[PDB]
Design a protein around this ligand. Structure first.
Ligand SMILES: [Mg+2]
Ligand SMILES: [Mg+2]
Ligand SMILES: [Mg+2]
Ligand SMILES: [Mg+2]
Ligand SMILES: [Mg+2]
Ligand SMILES: [Mg+2]
Ligand SMILES: [O]
Ligand SMILES: [O]
Lengths: 131, 199, 60, 116
RNA sequence: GACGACAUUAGACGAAUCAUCUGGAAAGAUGAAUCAAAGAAGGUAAUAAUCCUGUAGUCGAAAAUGUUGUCUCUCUUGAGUGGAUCCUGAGUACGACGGAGCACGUGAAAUUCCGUCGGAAUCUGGGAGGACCAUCUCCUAAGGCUAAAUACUCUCUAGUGACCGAUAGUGAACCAGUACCGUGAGGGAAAGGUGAAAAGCACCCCGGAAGGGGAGUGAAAUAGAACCUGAAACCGUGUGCUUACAAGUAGUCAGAGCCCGUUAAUGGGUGAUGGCGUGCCUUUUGUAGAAUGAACCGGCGAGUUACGAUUUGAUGCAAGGUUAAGCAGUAAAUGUGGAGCCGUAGCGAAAGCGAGUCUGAAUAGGGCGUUUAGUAUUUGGUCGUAGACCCGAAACCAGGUGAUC
RNA sequence: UAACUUGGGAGUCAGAACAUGGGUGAUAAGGUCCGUGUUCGAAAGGGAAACAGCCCAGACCACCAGCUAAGGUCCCAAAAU
RNA sequence: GACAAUGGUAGGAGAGCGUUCUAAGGGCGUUGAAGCAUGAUCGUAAGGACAUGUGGAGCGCUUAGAAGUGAGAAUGCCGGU
């Protein structure tokens, strides 16, 4: 490129469709005929004139919790945890480990909360722990 | 790979150049969108226009609605009427968008490859002086349009901008529009490793 | 502005590119049929997800 | 950057009006009227080409029958005489023949009359 | 209240070129030369780094102002222990009643304020911790002051524009809030350009004058003041062809006669005569339509923009991806900046459990989830919020102007 | 040779005539209301004197070529007194 | 080289022309720019060159970017006739 040679990609640009022009543009009226192409141009969000969108309230939502990490890692060997956010999670409100196809490599562990299948594996590997 | 540093017209010891900066096999698409990202940013939005609202004018109905024999009109200021407003006028904007951190680096490295693709030169400059003598320096033949890449702050060569066609940054910011205009660049031996390592 | 969610979202809850429901008729006149009175399941408005969106998308 | 829309309009309108040379009254000076009259013209051409083909087929047939009434061979006896003879040509050559030379036409009718 | 430095209100210096052709005139072409901390810009008889103003840089203030500094200048005790006894803001806080406001509509409705009315305590005290009691934790009203960070620009200085260039842009480029209209509040215009220089037509002639023909100024006066360029409508003068038995949405097709010669090719101008043929848009079940709009022509003039969602295409990364504000930086892509956001595991109203959960007596049966590709930026399509394709109402409300009819 | 799913985008909700089975109406309506099918609407051209819907037939452009469809062959007006 | 399709309003999809400006490159211009006028020319279209006259100083071209981007009709505004 010396700024007199440029040729960008294929499918990075297009026409813009100016409307209010032409007759042979494929436009000229652009919506209906007297119908409701007026300026406001709304049926009003979502509404047909009646009330099929009204169903019961089946709810509550208080505070909540944990993240996830599967047991599927083969990154570390013996490098017990809460050190890390690199090859696991970035954020932690409350940490928790789970299943996800087995870890045959033997590491310890350092965790809040624990899954059951995870427990019975990591005990058959090096360690189980709960803090 | 390697280039031959030199001094005023005499060869000197070779050097090493990363395959990843000056062998990055440039990418046109990235380079395109990069440059448009720059050339858009300089564009400031200082234009303006008056709609039918801000315009000093009227809501007075000049003639009443009906009984006339002429049309029905509400103001003497509207896009029709001479002196009226200008509907869907242009108004200021940011004229600036973003690209990721990495596509930038890929761009810089791409263009810098586009030089070494053909030829990009190197020198050791310690000339602390202030003059047009730096034009006689071009016995290296270093064709017209150029940057002259120094380390951070120099206050000697940068006052010599006044030549008809060149540039002279520090490496702290070297930009792919400052580059891609000129076809012949040069650089310092001290600093080429910086840009190479800094990417 | 950010776009405002329709706070009739308590009525419709997400799974995986879709919505979940409690069916409609309940909570007055429970005289009527036993089989009509087993109605705790899914509902949905399949084609009207086209209709009932870009107002409730933060939760979908 | 506002755009003075001038500098094209007039030129377009000249490229119309200068296809109005020979039209009557204010039809050869004014854009509007000459626009719409032009459009009528182009359409009329688009039916007139078809129309000339129809026409000259009529004309050639007329002249030809005007020839073969001389031997009182009405036009249809003849043509059927020609498809049976194992020969065939266009019209317009029967015309030009039977106009510029009579004898040739006579020999055609002999060649056809005897196949009936 | 004394006494120094810096900036501001006038300014100065400020490097460098000659010729030939064209020209009315060179700053252009042609050549050979020069300065650069100055090739920014504008003017100069046509397009100039080297002709002028100028810029880079440097210098400069008697007086006045403004901000800063050091001695004057003022003004000042600062902690600790012990806690016998006293003090820690009264018609207050709080409650009820009606109300407002707190994102919060009287709701279970805290916390804060208003009015009426009642009406506490004194550190072993009192208030809060979203009705209310308890334990725990934190804080101490009912008295007052407080720079910066921030929001705006009537105005000035210096600058800038993928801003306008006379129906645009301030309404206003000019003697404009003028002329004008109206009792009055108030509303509101149109109108730029000679040439390089006024050198702005001496003088003769007709003419009452105006105006003109001549002569001259000037490169050009068909640039001569209503003065650059000067289109179309419209109006004329002359002329090649044609037209006075003729029924015409006006053309097209065919075509003789008469004339002419091109951006030189199946030529151009006219057109006796015949065939064929009921305008344009809009709206409409359908319109030649006797349904609507347009007198002609010139100009003007209607899907835009931000923010956000969504999908489509591209592009970079990849089980990873990405920065926000802010800081430095040429009002700049370019570096920093890992709070935050998405995804990676879901189901259940929720506690919760977790590749299974929920429902359920059930391990049955079924709904959902399984089996990895996602994500940041962006062109386009669409939507929503903001007047949001344009023009168009009677009407409503607050404020004020008029009883000279 | 089309059919289905998903995703993006709309338009349309006033239909008319002809034939046909029917209701209503008076075995009236260029009527109205339904089913059935076509054409017009969004489709010119040839015929129906003339004509939105009837009849034949679906225009990419040009030719001074031909054969046919409906309907026609004395002049108008091409073609058999 | 064959084979087939190519009427079309609402409307959906696609490729395209020209204007103003910018950036870069390369070019024209008193030995007469732009605009204007005339013309029997090129291109499938929108459109563009060329010759000549007038005109008296700035303009094109290729690549790409952003647009106040196109006007025959509003009982449309203005101006002239
Ligand atoms: Mg109360
Ligand atoms: Mg009170
Ligand atoms: Mg003008
Ligand atoms: Mg139209
Ligand atoms: Mg009607
Ligand atoms: Mg008009
Ligand atoms: O209005
Ligand atoms: O309006």
């Amino acid at each position: 490129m010396k700024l007199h040679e440029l040729k960008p990609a294929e499918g990075s640009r297009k026409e813009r469709n100016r409307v209010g022009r032409g007759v042979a543009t494929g436009n000229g009226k652009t919506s209906g005929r007297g119908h409701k192409g007026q300026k406001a141009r709304s049926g009003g969000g979502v509404r047909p004139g009646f009330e099929g969108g009204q169903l019961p309230l089946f709810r509550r939502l208080p505070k909540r919790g944990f993240t996830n990490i599967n047991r599927k890692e083969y990154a570390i060997v013996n490098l017990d945890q809460l050190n890390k956010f690199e090859d696991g999670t970035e954020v932690t409100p409350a940490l928790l480990v789970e299943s996800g196809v087995v870890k045959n490599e033997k590491s310890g562990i350092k965790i809040l909360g624990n899954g059951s299948l995870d427990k019975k594996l990591t005990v058959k590997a090096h360690k189980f722990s709960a803090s | 790979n390697y280039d031959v540093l030199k001094l005023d017209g005499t060869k000197s010891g070779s050097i090493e150049l990363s395959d990843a900066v000056f062998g990055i096999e440039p990418n046109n698409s990235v380079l395109f969108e990069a440059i448009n990202l720059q050339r858009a940013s300089l564009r400031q939005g200082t234009h303006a226009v008056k709609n039918r609202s801000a315009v000093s004018g009227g809501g007075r109905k000049p003639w009443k609605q009906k009984g006339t024999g002429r049309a029905r009109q509400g103001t003497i200021r509207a896009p029709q009427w001479r002196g009226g407003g200008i509907v869907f006028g242009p108004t200021p904007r940011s004229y600036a968008y973003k690209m990721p951190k990495k596509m930038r680096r890929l761009a810089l490295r791409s263009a810098l490859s586009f030089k070494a693709q053909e030829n990009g030169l190197t020198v050791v400059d310690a000339f602390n002086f202030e003059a047009p003598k730096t034009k006689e320096f071009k016995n290296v033949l270093s064709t017209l349009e150029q940057p002259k890449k120094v380390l951070v702050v120099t206050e000697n060569e940068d006052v010599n901008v006044e030549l008809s066609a060149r540039n002279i940054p520090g490496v702290q910011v070297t930009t792919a529009q400052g580059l891609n205009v000129l076809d012949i660049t040069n650089a310092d031996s001290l600093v080429i490793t910086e840009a190479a390592a800094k990417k | 502005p950010k776009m405002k969610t329709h706070r009739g979202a308590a009525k419709r809850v997400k799974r995986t590119a879709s919505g979940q429901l409690k069916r409609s008729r309940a909570f007055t006149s429970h005289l009527f049929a036993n089989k009509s009175t087993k109605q705790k399941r899914q509902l949905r408005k399949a084609r009207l997800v086209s209709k009932s969106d870009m107002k409730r998308v933060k939760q979908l | 950057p506002r755009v003075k829309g001038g500098t094209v309009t007039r030129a377009r309108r000249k490229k119309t009006i200068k296809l109005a040379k020979g039209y009557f009254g204010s039809k050869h000076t004014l854009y509007k009227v000459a626009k719409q009259q032009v459009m009528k013209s182009g359409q009329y051409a688009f039916r007139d080409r078809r129309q000339r083909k129809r026409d000259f087929r009529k004309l050639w047939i007329t002249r030809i029958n005007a020839a073969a009434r001389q031997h009182e061979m009405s036009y249809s006896r003849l043509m059927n005489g020609l498809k049976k003879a194992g020969i065939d040509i266009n019209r317009k050559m029967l015309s030009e023949i039977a106009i510029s030379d009579e004898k040739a036409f006579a020999q055609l009718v002999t060649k056809a009359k005897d196949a009936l």
